[PDB]
């Protein structure tokens, strides 16, 4: 299987396409993990560091997240099988990088970590601005600027 | 058998060992560079901080690096420690052990001559040649492995003493079967692309002028990553000596086209 990057658009010819995201449920009750297997390839296909899309699930779900250089596992704590992610797999696009003028997420970020500001720019119609101040992930991005 | 000059280890230096059992006060161990003699590591000497399980610091049959903290010569008692050992000293211990295991693998096989009835022949073959080849160098830090490497390039080392033909050939083979890939260790990188409209005639000097006064038979080896990235091998010399030929070759490669109306970055 393969998919469009976002399912709010039903078009077969939509500009954005990527591999599936698949995960393992591991352990037993009071200590369950969900580990995301494709995360480095999905982060490469979306042109972002793999910390940002992993951190967004913990911000929405109300859950802990882990990262590890010794084992390369990316983890969201608790059981999040099937619909518990797959109803909202669009979200890292749908709550950040859709343009309000047109539904075309051909979109870039630049971080000014010395001055508490994240700049945003979409190629599709020239839409520019910043990320939202009520939204969760802004406090993580300013402490973790892009490569 | 023993691998070294002396009957017992000296205090405050590192030995290679193998673990045999674990008890209430410590682990019991056999030293490998000596003839399997007994010593022990106390449980207080394993770590600077709290131990979650002992089985993941030590288990039976694994090889290990430790210092000798005390010795009594008369009773044959040796105390060992692991809290002391830095990772550079563990690498140094593996080099001493590898240089010793290779020499011993020669002498143990060379001993399979005459009657070979007892370990007396092993101790007699260890004495004289192999012992006088490194007793002189204990302080500089060499072993008989270096004397064997000298005996490979010139057998006059062996001719200086009473000798056997296995002791000549097995000694040489346990270096040469590993040393014979004396492979290429320098190549040049050149950015040249040629202006010359006579090139198919003229560049056949730049391909061949790289060293003076050779035989007419002397080869060189030439390579290419892509057409604007020219590469050459410096007469198969090692990286300890070929640095002059490297600097000369790249100068000659540019000279034999700048002589011929070309111009390039120096």
């Amino acid at each position: 299987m393969s998919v469009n990057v976002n399912r709010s658009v039903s078009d077969q010819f939509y500009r954005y396409k990527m591999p599936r995201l698949i995960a393992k449920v591991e352990g037993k009750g009071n200590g369950i993990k969900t580990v995301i297997v494709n995360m480095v390839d999905v982060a490469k296909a979306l042109n972002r560091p793999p910390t940002y899309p992993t951190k967004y699930f913990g911000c929405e779900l109300g859950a802990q997240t882990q990262f590890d250089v010794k084992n390369d596992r990316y983890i969201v704590n608790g059981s999040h099988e099937a619909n518990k992610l797959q109803d909202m797999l669009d979200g890292f696009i749908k709550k950040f990088v859709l343009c309000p003028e047109c539904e075309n997420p051909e979109t870039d970020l630049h971080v000014n970590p010395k001055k508490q500001t994240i700049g945003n720019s979409c190629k599709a119609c020239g839409y520019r601005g910043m990320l939202d101040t009520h939204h969760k992930l802004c406090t993580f991005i300013l402490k973790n600027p892009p490569e | 058998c023993r691998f070294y000059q002396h009957k017992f280890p000296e205090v405050e230096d590192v030995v290679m060992v193998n673990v045999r059992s674990i008890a209430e006060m410590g682990a019991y161990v056999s030293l490998l560079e000596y003839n399997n003699i007994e010593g022990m590591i106390l449980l207080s000497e394993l770590s600077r901080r709290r131990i979650r399980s002992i089985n993941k610091l030590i288990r039976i049959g694994r090889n290990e690096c430790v210092v000798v903290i005390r010795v009594d010569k008369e009773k044959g008692y040796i105390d060992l420690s692991k809290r002391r050992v830095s990772p550079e000293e563990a690498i140094k211990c593996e080099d001493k052990f590898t240089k010793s295991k290779t020499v011993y693998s020669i002498l143990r096989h060379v001993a399979e001559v005459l009657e070979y009835t007892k370990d007396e022949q092993l101790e007699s073959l260890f004495q004289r040649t192999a012992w006088v080849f490194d007793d002189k160098y204990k302080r500089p830090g060499y072993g008989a492995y270096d004397a064997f490497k000298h005996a490979v390039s010139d057998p006059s080392i062996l001719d200086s003493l009473d000798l056997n033909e296995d002791e000549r050939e097995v000694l040489i083979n346990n270096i040469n079967r590993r040393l014979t890939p004396q492979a290429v260790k320098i190549r040049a990188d050149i950015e040249v692309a040629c202006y010359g409209y006579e090139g198919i005639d003229a560049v056949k000097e730049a391909l061949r002028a790289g060293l003076n006064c050779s035989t007419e038979t002397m080869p060189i080896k030439i390579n290419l990553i892509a057409p604007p990235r020219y590469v050459m091998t410096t007469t198969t010399l090692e990286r300890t000596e070929g640095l002059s030929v490297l600097n000369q070759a790249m100068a000659v490669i540019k000279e034999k086209i700048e002589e011929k109306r070309g111009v390039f970055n120096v």
Binding site: - | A193, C194, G196, Y197, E198, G199, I200, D201, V203, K204, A206, L207, I222, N223, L224, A226, P227, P228, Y230, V263
Partner: protein
């Protein structure tokens, strides 16, 4: 060598591989460690023969059946004759012209090295297809009237939509070219009717005049094959130029030159640029080596140059001749010009900025083409019909009769018109 050379010309999404194989037996390609797309996007070639039996048909190299291989489920077949002995009509080879307007300079060069055009048509976009003017108006301005049309990808298209295509084209050409080019239909999947293309390249196309004894002229476009293996890493074969001889007999060991050549290093500008010249080392055509050559045919010419010039097509659109030849070399240009009556390149159901071209200004860089070359042109002085410019690389011609002009009217240059030297 050859008697005539034919340019296969078209637009995006029309295909290439099946029809270029059908007319020649040769797959047009460029080597890359990557998948083959719908088009060969940049100028290429396909070597060929044209032959018959005693009765009109185009056989395979085994003469008894026309049996196909382009579709997995069927074996479309006919008998040209009972294993009859084949007869060659004439020696021919194909110029595989660019598949996209992005390469329009290289397309005008491809249209100049051909003696005649094949123009290719397909059902994949709406009826009034615009390249039917864009190529043929320039081809008439470079005086090459010899044209044919070939309807390729129509395997699932009805006869009324195939009509509506050629009829809206027949209405559209009224301001840009004469209608007098024959149309041949085929199948792209089944190889149906393809031997009528072979018959029409005998029926429509003449052999053109050239001088066999006047001073040598050659056009070059291609870096021909030189390969990595060798016991000497530099200059084992020397660089080979792919081109077509315009004028004069040619021979091995002759000194030949390229007119625009190169700008000399340590020059402060356009001064000290010079031709480049050498003895011809070898010749290639029709899968044979040669010692001698003639005007009017595609050929490979061997030279002493570094193969680092040949690992890519650096040699696109160059004019060559005998060492020390007369024809004037231009590094700056005096121009007079005229612009197209519509903006052109693509079309749909109604107007998309198709109005007349806005006038030129001095604060801009043109792409400008002469003979079978190309260069970038920067303005010294201009008016809406006339100007004076300086060139980022030199160019040459035997007479200043024509130029073709392209402007940065959007992100990449489009053709906007033509002109002459003053």
């Amino acid at each position: 060598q050859a008697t005539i050379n034919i340019g296969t010309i078209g637009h995006v999404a029309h295909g290439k591989s099946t029809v270029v194989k059908a007319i020649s037996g040769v797959h047009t390609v460029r080597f890359k460690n990557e998948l083959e797309r719908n088009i060969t996007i940049k100028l290429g070639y396909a070597n060929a023969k044209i032959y018959k039996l005693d009765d009109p048909s185009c056989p395979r190299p085994e003469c008894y059946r026309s049996c196909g291989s382009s579709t997995p489920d069927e074996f479309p077949t006919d008998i040209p004759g009972t294993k009859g002995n084949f007869k060659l009509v004439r020696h021919v080879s194909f110029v595989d012209c660019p598949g996209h307007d992005i390469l329009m300079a290289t397309m005008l060069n491809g249209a100049a090295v051909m003696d005649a055009a094949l123009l290719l048509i397909a059902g994949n976009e709406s009826c009034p297809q615009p390249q039917t003017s864009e190529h043929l108006a320039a081809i008439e301005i470079m005086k090459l009237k010899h044209i044919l049309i070939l309807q390729n990808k129509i395997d699932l298209v009805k006869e009324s939509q195939a009509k509506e295509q050629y009829e809206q084209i027949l209405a559209f050409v009224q301001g840009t070219v004469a209608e007098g080019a024959p149309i041949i239909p085929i199948s792209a999947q089944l190889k149906y009717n393809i031997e009528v293309v072979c018959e029409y390249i005998v029926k429509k196309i003449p052999v053109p005049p050239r001088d066999f004894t006047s001073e040598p002229r050659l056009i070059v476009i291609r870096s021909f094959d030189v390969n990595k293996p060798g016991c000497e890493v530099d200059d084992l074969k020397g660089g080979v130029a792919g081109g077509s001889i315009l004028k004069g007999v040619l021979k091995v060991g002759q000194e030949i030159e390229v007119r625009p050549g190169i700008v000399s290093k340590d020059s402060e500008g356009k001064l000290m640029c010079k031709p480049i010249f050498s003895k011809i080392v070898s010749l290639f055509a029709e899968h044979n080596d040669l010692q001698y050559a003639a005007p009017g045919g595609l050929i490979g010419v061997g030279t002493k140059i570094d193969p680092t010039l040949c690992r890519a097509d650096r040699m696109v659109g160059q004019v060559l001749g005998a060492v020390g030849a007369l024809p004037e070399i231009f590094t700056e240009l005096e121009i007079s010009y005229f612009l197209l009556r519509r903006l052109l390149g693509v079309r749909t159901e109604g107007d998309k900025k198709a109005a007349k071209v806005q006038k030129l200004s001095k604060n801009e860089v043109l792409m400008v083409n002469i003979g079978s070359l190309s260069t970038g042109g920067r303005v010294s002085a201009v008016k809406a019909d006339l100007g004076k410019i300086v060139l980022t690389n030199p160019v040459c011609t035997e007479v200043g009769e024509k130029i073709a002009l392209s402007r940065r009217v959007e992100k990449h240059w489009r053709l906007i018109g033509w002109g002459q030297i003053r």
